[PDB]
């Protein structure tokens, strides 16, 4: 029963129009719980899960103050980075940041992260030691030198090991009815003739949480990946997830195939046969 807290942010410059657009979201495991959008009318960090709404006005005032400062700093950094690369003002560019912490079942810090990207490729990241940085290019080495002089790593580490794991523990307590649940997948199989010779067997997993799941196809009890197809796990829109796996089989041999579904919410793995 490990858990994570993660904050994502995306800043895109809009050279035709006015200021950059900044969107931040926060997540606990696979559940989003806050958002901020610099274009939105409210100008507040906003709740996106029920169990965060019990936080009072000091919390929402604090998160709004801090995320607005993150937004403004990204604005500055888009200009700074464009100058580092000698890039044209006519082009739109993107800064993305992800940071957060993992904890185990006992609430103890497992590891912490902070990764930065520019135009969708690594720019700079805090290393596994929580002490040093990896810069992806010459421009990021300018940033690395600045963050070394400023001792950013030490201030960030204190958040990751402290503040981050404390609030995560509090959120996991306040949202335990939904955060510490497992919804097992609802499973079924469909069958879709392709020709007289062939048919598709599709194995469905619906309404599960968390998103982690394994769907396997077998023929006569032997694992089968030939003629398989796995779709990306996708949100249902209600906080649960969906996935399917298919296999193309000779007509009349459907009975030989079995689908196997493993998920945290299932006591025993499920086996399906057409």
């Amino acid at each position: 029963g490990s858990h994570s807290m993660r904050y994502f942010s995306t800043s895109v410059s809009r050279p035709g129009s006015g200021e950059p657009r900044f969107i931040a979201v926060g997540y606990v495991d696979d559940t989003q719980f806050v958002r901020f959008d610099s274009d939105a009318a409210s100008q507040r960090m906003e709740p996106r899960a029920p169990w965060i709404e019990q936080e009072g006005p000091e919390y929402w005032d604090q998160e709004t103050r801090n995320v607005k400062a993150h937004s403004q700093t990204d604005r500055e950094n888009l200009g700074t980075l464009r100058g580092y690369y000698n890039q044209s003002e006519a082009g739109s560019h993107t800064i993305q940041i992800m940071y957060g912490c993992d904890v185990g079942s006992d609430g103890r810090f497992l590891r912490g992260y902070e990764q930065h990207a520019y135009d969708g490729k690594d720019y700079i990241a805090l290393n596994e030691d929580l002490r040093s940085w990896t810069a992806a290019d010459m421009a990021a080495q300018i940033t690395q030198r600045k963050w070394e002089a400023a001792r950013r790593a030490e201030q960030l580490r204190a958040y990751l090991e402290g503040t981050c794991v404390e609030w995560l523990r509090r959120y996991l307590e306040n949202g335990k009815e939904t955060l510490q649940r497992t919804d097992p997948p609802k499973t079924h199989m469909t069958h879709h003739p392709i020709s007289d010779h062939e048919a598709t067997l599709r194995c469905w997993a619906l309404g599960f949480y968390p998103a982690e799941i394994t769907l396997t196809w077998q023929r006569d009890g032997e694992d089968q990946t030939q003629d398989t197809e796995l779709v990306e796990t996708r949100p249902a829109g209600d906080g649960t997830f969906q996935k399917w796996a298919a296999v193309v089989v000779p007509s009349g041999e459907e009975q030989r195939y079995t689908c196997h579904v493993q998920h945290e919410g299932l006591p025993k793995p499920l086996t399906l046969r057409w």
Partner: peptide, 9 residues
Amino acid sequence: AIFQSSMTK
């Protein structure tokens, strides 16, 4: 809760 400081690059 978010980290309080983001730094210029």
